Amino acid sequence: QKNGDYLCVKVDRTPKGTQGVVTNFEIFRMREKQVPVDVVEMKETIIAFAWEPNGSKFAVLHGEAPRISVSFYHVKNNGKIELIKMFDKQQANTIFWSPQGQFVVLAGLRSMN
Amino acid sequence: WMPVTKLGRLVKDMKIKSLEEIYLFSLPIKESEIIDFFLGASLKDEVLKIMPVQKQTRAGQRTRFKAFVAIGDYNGHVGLGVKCSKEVATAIRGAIILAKLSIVPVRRGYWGNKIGKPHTVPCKVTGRCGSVLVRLIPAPRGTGIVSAPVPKKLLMMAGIDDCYTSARGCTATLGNFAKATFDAISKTYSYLTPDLWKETVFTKSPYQEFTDHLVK
Amino acid sequence: VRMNVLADALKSINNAEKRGKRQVLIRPCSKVIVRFLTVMMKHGYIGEFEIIDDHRAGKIVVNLTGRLNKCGVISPRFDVQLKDLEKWQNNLLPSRQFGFIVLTTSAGIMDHEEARRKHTGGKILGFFF
Amino acid sequence: PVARSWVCRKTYVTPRRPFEKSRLDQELKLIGEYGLRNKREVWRVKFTLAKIRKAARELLTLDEKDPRRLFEGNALLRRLVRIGVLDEGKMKLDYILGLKIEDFLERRLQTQVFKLGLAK
Amino acid sequence: MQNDAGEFVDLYVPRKCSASNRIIGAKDHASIQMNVAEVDKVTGRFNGQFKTYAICGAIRRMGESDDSILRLAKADGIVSKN
Amino acid sequence: QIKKKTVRERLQIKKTELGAKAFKDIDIEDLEELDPDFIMAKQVEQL
RNA sequence: UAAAGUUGCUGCAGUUAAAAAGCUCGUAGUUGGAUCUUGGGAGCGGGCGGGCGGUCCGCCGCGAGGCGAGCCACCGCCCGUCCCCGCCUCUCGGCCGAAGCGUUUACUUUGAAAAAAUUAGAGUGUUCAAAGCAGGCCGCCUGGAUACCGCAGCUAGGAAUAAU
Numbered sequence: 001q002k003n004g005d006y007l008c009v010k011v012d013r014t015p016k017g018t019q020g021v022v023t024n025f026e027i028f029r030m031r032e033k034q035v036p037v038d039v040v041e042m043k044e045t046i047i048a049f050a051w052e053p054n055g056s057k058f059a060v061l062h063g064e065a066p067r068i069s070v071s072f073y074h075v076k077n078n079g080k081i082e083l084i085k086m087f088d089k090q091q092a093n094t095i096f097w098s099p100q101g102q103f104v105v106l107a108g109l110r111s112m113n
Numbered sequence: 114w115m116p117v118t119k120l121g122r123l124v125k126d127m128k129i130k131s132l133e134e135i136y137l138f139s140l141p142i143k144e145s146e147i148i149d150f151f152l153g154a155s156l157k158d159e160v161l162k163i164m165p166v167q168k169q170t171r172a173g174q175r176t177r178f179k180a181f182v183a184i185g186d187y188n189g190h191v192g193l194g195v196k197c198s199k200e201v202a203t204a205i206r207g208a209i210i211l212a213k214l215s216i217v218p219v220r221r222g223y224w225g226n227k228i229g230k231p232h233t234v235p236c237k238v239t240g241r242c243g244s245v246l247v248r249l250i251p252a253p254r255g256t257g258i259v260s261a262p263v264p265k266k267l268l269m270m271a272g273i274d275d276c277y278t279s280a281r282g283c284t285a286t287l288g289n290f291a292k293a294t295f296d297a298i299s300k301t302y303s304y305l306t307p308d309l310w311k312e313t314v315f316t317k318s319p320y321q322e323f324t325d326h327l328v329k
Numbered sequence: 330v331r332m333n334v335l336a337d338a339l340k341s342i343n344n345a346e347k348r349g350k351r352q353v354l355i356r357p358c359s360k361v362i363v364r365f366l367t368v369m370m371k372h373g374y375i376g377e378f379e380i381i382d383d384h385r386a387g388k389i390v391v392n393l394t395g396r397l398n399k400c401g402v403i404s405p406r407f408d409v410q411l412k413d414l415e416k417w418q419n420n421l422l423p424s425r426q427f428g429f430i431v432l433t434t435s436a437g438i439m440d441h442e443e444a445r446r447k448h449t450g451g452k453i454l455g456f457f458f
Numbered sequence: 459p460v461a462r463s464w465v466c467r468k469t470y471v472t473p474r475r476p477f478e479k480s481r482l483d484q485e486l487k488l489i490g491e492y493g494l495r496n497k498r499e500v501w502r503v504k505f506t507l508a509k510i511r512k513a514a515r516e517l518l519t520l521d522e523k524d525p526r527r528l529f530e531g532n533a534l535l536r537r538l539v540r541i542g543v544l545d546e547g548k549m550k551l552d553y554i555l556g557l558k559i560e561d562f563l564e565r566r567l568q569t570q571v572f573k574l575g576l577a578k
Numbered sequence: 579m580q581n582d583a584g585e586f587v588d589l590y591v592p593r594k595c596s597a598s599n600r601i602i603g604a605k606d607h608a609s610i611q612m613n614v615a616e617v618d619k620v621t622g623r624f625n626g627q628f629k630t631y632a633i634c635g636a637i638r639r640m641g642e643s644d645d646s647i648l649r650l651a652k653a654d655g656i657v658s659k660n
Numbered sequence: 661q662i663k664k665k666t667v668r669e670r671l672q673i674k675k676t677e678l679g680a681k682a683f684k685d686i687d688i689e690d691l692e693e694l695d696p697d698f699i700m701a702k703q704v705e706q707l
Numbered sequence: 708u709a710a711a712g713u714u715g716c717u718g719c720a721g722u723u724a725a726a727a728a729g730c731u732c733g734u735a736g737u738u739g740g741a742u743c744u745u746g747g748g749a750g751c752g753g754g755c756g757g758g759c760g761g762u763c764c765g766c767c768g769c770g771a772g773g774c775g776a777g778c779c780a781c782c783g784c785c786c787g788u789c790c791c792c793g794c795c796u797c798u799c800g801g802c803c804g805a806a807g808c809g810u811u812u813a814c815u816u817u818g819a820a821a822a823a824a825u826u827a828g829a830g831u832g833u834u835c836a837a838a839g840c841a842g843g844c845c846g847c848c849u850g851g852a853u854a855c856c857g858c859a860g861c862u863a864g865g866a867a868u869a870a871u
Contacts (some may be wrong), residue, residue: 017578024575040576100706133590136604138611167591199659219587220487225425226552228582235579236423250426252556253515262478281712301605302592306429308579310373310396313594315630318611349637357741361765361868379594386741395599406740406868416517420717423825435815435865444760445521446789452868465825466837474710504835513827526828526854533829567835608699694776698765 002053002097005031006075010046021045032077040081050095050104059104061093068093070106114146119320119327124150128323136218138318148213155186158209159266162287163201168324182208183271184216192216195288209235219271220301224253232274236304241294243282243289250277251296263287264294270299293299335361336402339455340388343400346393353393357386361454364438366391368431369400369457372440372448380434398423398458406452414441421456428458470501471508492563493572505564510534514554540566595634597646608635610643614651629654 001007008025015022023045029036046062058081061070069090075081094107116122120140123129124147135142142148147226149156161181161226167174179197181203194211198204222235233251240247252275258268258280267278284290320327331337337356345353355362358380366389369375378391401421409417414438418441422428430441434451444450461551473481485500513534520527531551537578538544544553563569571577579588593602593611602609611632618625631650633643651657 137590137592139604139606139609141607193657207610220588222424223426223581227551230581231587235426253511253518254552255511255557279712280649286407299603299605303601303606305396305398305599305601306424306579307396309591309594309601311591313634315593315611321613330739334740349600349642359741365866383752385753410815433868434728435867439867443789448790448816449865452814463824463838465839469837514829528829529853677762691776694765 001051004031006051006058008049008051012045027075027081038080045067048093048095050097053097053099055101059095059106061106063093063094064089065110065112068108071096072104115281116144118143121147122327123323126326128326129319133218134319137282140319142214142216145210145213145255146261148216150244152186152216154191156184156213156214157270158182158184159270160208161263161266161291163204164287166197178204180204180208181288182212183266183291184209184212186272188272189214189218189221189231191219191267191295191298193270193291211294217299218302219298220275220304221273222306224251224275229254233276234273234298234301235306238297238304240293240298240300240302242292242296243286245280245282245284245286245289245293247281247290247293247297249294250275251275252281254304261290263290267291267294267298273298333402333404334359335365335454336404338362339365339400339402342397344392346397346400351393355389355393356390358389361438363391365431365454368429368438368440370396372429373454374457380456399453400440400457402407402455403453406454409450409453411445411448411450414445417441417453421458428456430456470498470505482556488560488563492560492566493568494563503559507557507559510538510557511555512553518551538560593597593632595637595640596650597633597637597642598629600630600634600636602634606608606635609633610635610645611635 004054006101007030007045009063010025014020021072024041027038027040029038031075033071035056042062044062046060046065048061050061052058056074056076058073058075060073061068069087069098070092070113071083072079077093080103091108091113092106092107094109096105096107098105114323116125120129120135120142121144124135129135132148135147146260159182161183163177165176166179167176167312173323177197177199179195179199182194182196184192184194192212192215194208194213194215195208196204196211198207220234220235221231223231224233231243232254234249235251237251238249249268254275256275256277258265258273258276258278260268260276261280261284262281263284264278280290280293334357337346338357338359342353343357356449363380366375366378370394374396376394378389379389381390403421414430414432415430418428431438431454432441432444432456433439434444434447434449436447436449438454439447455458475481485495485497488500489497513530517527517531517534522528535544535549535551535554538554538557539546539549542565543557564573579586581587588595594600595602595609609632611630614629614631615624616627616629617623629651631647633646637643637646646655650660
């Protein structure tokens, strides 16, 4: 996180145990007490990542270059995180993060259009 | 499949669009490919008993095999057919045909505080055939079917999630016990609840509307 | 001889309702039966009726739309306290969603859900559903 | 006269029909999925869900502003949201009865070591 | 029938009898639905509009379908009031 | 009877339903006029 | 012990299956017909439901106030609902709290008194649990609840149903 709150690790791991092709984030909480670790899964792999500077939201973009879909997460200070909006047939894979808060700009501008 | 009935020429053409228009007017179902047409992928049967019955003659005994078959699509639909014939595969095949011809819809209802989807019979229903009197009771959400094995098959087949049961009589003769449970669950669409008090509108019959289609 | 007049009146209603008839004639007429049939009428189960006055114990002619599956009596009139009302409505009624137990309380003759809302119990009279 | 306590209870209920193939099939599937050792470890979870559902099935026949309902329903749903088998929004007493038996087997430490990636 | 989200969850709503208001079930195979045609008031010819009555089979078996058809046609202006 | 048959095969009721659908679409568009003003107002109050 | 609706008060059965006295009369016991204030407005408050003015976002005019988006949240109002009282006893004590009493009882609803332990049950990571009454935070804070306990007795509110 760009204020140092959270650390998300994006894996290219699929399990060798299960056939299922799934990736996980270990989210630590460093500023909160005794460093809790939470997991949040996806059915697909990610091609990008975004952590919000100074925000209680998070933007996560997963998928291939034809299938790059972003999901806007809202992670509170105490509790767990969830998914609000997933978009089908999207290509927005470039995320410019503003210092103002409450606004994200999402571009599909890598090397086809 | 060439149909022979007026209902069959309305069903092997897209003129009757669901099975409840056929149940709704109590039109008598007399050929078993209508049930294969409407329910399709969701019909699973299970054979309940194969009993030998024997007729004494001066030629010895003459033994038949009498099969019971249940069938059903597990939201609404339950049938039971009995067909007694000389070879066992013949009795099972005829019982499957007769089990498709006797499918009735089950009205499922709620326990109290009725959120969600209906999970039990709406009221305490009782059905009797032979000497067996089989009572079905509404139950809470998530109790399973508390019953004997032969009506557990009939109540799990009809899409009833939860029930409580009480049964009287000589239950060991399987035909009356399954026929009494079938009389118990064919009766929920004859029971006049206070929510069925609303005055009915009458619509056109299938033979009344599709009668200039049918005369060709 | 004739005992408990309300029971024989409700068996007259039930036998003439099961045949699909449209009007019954009840004899005698208590003041118990007029409050009981007031209770069944106010729930929309029987419709209007008339209390025929001869100077003896009168007759009652009830209209019937068949809506009525069973109309029964409980004899003797057992004392139903407020903790024994759920044990009684589990036994006689067909559902948690409909059906009623009529019971005679110190606020009047009333059904079983009104007796929970008025916070009183009393002796049972019968049921209808 | 001793300074003792003899208070104990059994924590499983043996099934009535012992050789029904459907019961053997479903509980052996739960043994093989969730890494239990024997069928008593399944029946104990059936007993604790049966005790929870008996408590809710007792409370649900009351008038809804009787204060035993309003106190003990809040305590029971708070314990079920605390252990995680009933989610945070749907704290109503009618959602206790929609607990399947696989909720309490997911919150064991063995299944939460396998699902948190600490074993192969 | 109707759960708390307002949904109508029943499979179908069965007909009721016009004579006894009993639920005509799926397998009440003796029950009828009878159209009785209206006529136009000036010419006395059938003009396309109907009257529809349904009788369950248990009323029909005891001989009481005729009198209920006579009463239901009397009350909707088909039989005269003498 | 032929006009009744033609109306039933096609489906005043359809015209009323189309008018209601057009009114619902117009109501959504007017809310967009408030919102695009408000999103511009969101730009203005920030700046 | 459940299964046993094979002890059946809820809940069995008696023509032929085991089974109703040969037949009336009769005391105790058990049961016992209808009938005696039902009516009808009204408002007080506590909620039920809708609606209205305001709190509410974009815009008008500096601005008052509002206009279009409401009832997601809060405040009061307008009219109809489920409970409450009133028009329709007397001796007398500081605009009556106090007090002379009225046929009984059965019934119901509250209130008192009901040994703890056990039983449902709240709190609390004995490493979980059966248990236990502990414990928690870097001297301080806080638990050791509660409910049911049938019948008989006691009590004040009700007076339909039942006897006299």
